[PDB]
Symmetry: C3
């Protein structure tokens, strides 16, 4: 069962929103840890629930591994407004962030260390690979597979039944319309001055 206190590793902007979600869940105190300011992580800290509040997928993973290896429990932070199908699977105690108004539909699967950011949507039967980040307003249509460590930018989307290779980036505003077997950076067209 959840501890009264939680360690939040990452004390900048992402830490701010993780703290709001932790408070929404009923945590009474959030204690920030950070390598570059304020209080540091030490292997020797009391066993409170942990969360890794770092947006960068590669760094969140590295820090996640260090925390796990030190025997700490890395909880999921899931906003109460998130709507999760009873047949959806969200990996338990796996440092998953689920932000306000996220929807996860039937049989979708969420792997460890994932960020589902504000108002993102994961449609039925999706598979969202570990340490991926689905940003604000980003949406996966039915039966989409997102590879491990992927980043989907703000307001990006993936059409139904598509697969995105591990370690790929889908740019903010971009629409993925075909399978990508090989990793890459897939971008849309930026706003242009008239």
């Amino acid at each position: 069962a959840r501890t009264e206190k939680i360690y939040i590793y990452g004390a900048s902007g992402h830490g701010l929103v993780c703290e709001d979600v932790a408070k929404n869940m009923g945590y009474k105190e959030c204690i920030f840890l950070d390598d570059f300011k304020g209080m540091k992580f030490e292997s020797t800290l009391p066993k409170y629930d942990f969360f890794i509040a770092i947006g960068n997928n590669e760094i969140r993973k590295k820090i996640y591994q260090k925390i796990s290896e030190n025997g700490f429990k890395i909880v999921n932070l899931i906003h109460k407004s998130a709507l999760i199908s009873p047949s959806a699977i969200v990996e338990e105690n796996a440092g998953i962030l689920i932000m306000p108004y996220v929807v996860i539909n039937a049989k979708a699967k969420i792997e460890k260390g994932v960020i589902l950011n504000t108002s993102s949507v994961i449609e039925h039967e999706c598979v969202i690979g570990e340490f991926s980040h689905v940003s604000v307003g980003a949406k996966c249509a039915g039966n989409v597979k997102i590879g491990k460590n992927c980043f989907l930018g703000i307001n990006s989307c993936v059409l139904p039944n598509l697969s995105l290779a591990d370690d790929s980036i889908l740019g903010g505003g971009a629409t993925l319309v075909k399978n990508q077997d090989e990793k890459g950076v897939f971008v849309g067209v930026p706003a242009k001055r008239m």
Copy 2:
């Protein structure tokens, strides 16, 4: 008043989400019907509430007509999280799907057999033509008319006051900025590898 059981016609991915909405509404049992697997529709089935859980607009319509002609009631499945203005009009018992976190604002009109998919928005004074599908995250601005049988792809949008011809497709991620008097397939720019 709603029956305890509901027949859901279409036993694949769309059927999965329709079942979640039916359960959210308080249905106790969903019975899948499908022409190509499991239990079949027969004219002779007991009169439970029906829903047509088929995404394809043309097929949903054909099946809708068959079910109506056999004297069955095709209900609307409306998630409790949908926000519908008191002056909005949603055709009663007309096989309309309204998914989680859909918003329908003042005086908007929703015709029969429509799908309003996850987190779509129908702004004030819109008219959404029968058997249209507004996909996940797709949004119609104020006073938009969507013709009969249209498909609006994931994260597509229509600017205020525009009209889209019957039997048109607006691609995933695409932005309709002008009236379309003649049907067509209107597409945006797909993500491109850098």
Copy 3:
């Protein structure tokens, strides 16, 4: 404390949605005022709460100033479904519209006369300049500054840490990927017939 009645200045489409929000907040009666139909504003009206229900930023501002100078209180209309971080700052009694399912995250700041339209998202640490309009589904990523009087079209978005100059327009569906020090109209690529 809120009056039982509210004057809504602007009796067209935007007035319709402002009225729904006012009713959601518990107002018992909305009285429409408009320069070009129905009942007019007069300096001499009883002091009910006011709201300026005009979408155009320039006109909303002009009318806002007239109403303020006549000693009326211009309230915020905030839908109950809006999720606002406890560390977010929304200017009090400042004619701000916050529509259904808007999310405002940690430390974001909302200035006077702003419209946050249906399902828009304002991420952590954003600054949204006075009399701006963030339309339906438009989203600002972390630490974005939107200048005074800006318009962000339906389903547009701004990438993290960017700044948009005062009096700018970001078109419907458009993705702002760089800082804009000088005002302009920044547009995406419209849907094209195949």
